[PDB]
Amino acid sequence: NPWTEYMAKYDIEEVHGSGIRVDLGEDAEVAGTQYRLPSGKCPVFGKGIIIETTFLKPVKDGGFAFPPTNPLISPMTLNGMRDFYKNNEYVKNLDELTLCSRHAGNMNPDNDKNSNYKYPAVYDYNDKKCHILYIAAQENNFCFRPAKDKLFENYTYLSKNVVDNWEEVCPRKNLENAKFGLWVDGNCEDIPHVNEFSANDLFECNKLVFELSASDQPKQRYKSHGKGYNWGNYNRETQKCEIFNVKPTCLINNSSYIATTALSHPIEVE
């Protein structure tokens, strides 16, 4: 298969390895008590939390983010973070997403003993700010739910395990004029079975895929480990979001299609 190396980033079960809609793929002990926490290795572009107050406010009059500190480590700009770690060569040059992830993982809630609990974070591309999330909960149907939304399009949900080479091994852009397929005997065949959801544009298709994707918590043993309906073939002409749950192994050239994933940005194409 000539597509092997290229299609590696779309093996979400392998490269991400956790829930996407709701990421709770690991556990960590804080002062004698185990807690669930995000552990996906890829960044989730466009993911935010809808409260039914925005969730990026510091922790009903508060949100999910870290409370004010001295000095202020949350929220912290990209330049603020690079200046903060200017003596650390292993950190200061990290990309904005990994750096935000490592910055959040630098704060230990257990001030008595070193623990494994590392807070998730959201990087806002709009004002280049890293928000450390004090609340790792993602759905409770004080009710809230995870979603991709126009308001969240510049948000990026980051677990503690976001790899520093996500640009190389994780999805971001949607593939224009391309259709996910399965490589069989020297040819890229169509996904034999897909679940068709109607969608007005690419954004709504990406939104639908996210809603159906790998989740580590049932809506309304729980770990998905990356398994789920993570991919979608969007036919822009028929306005169909063709959603499936098996990894694609090749691409098909088709001008009517845009290949998207639950991890991918809801707008960007290449």
């Binding site: 500190t69 950190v91 630098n106």
Partner: peptide, 13 residues
């Protein structure tokens, strides 16, 4: 209050 894991370790409250 939190504790920085990386050097220098310090307490941020």
């Amino acid at each position: 209050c939190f504790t920085a894991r990386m050097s220098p370790p310090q307490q941020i409250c």
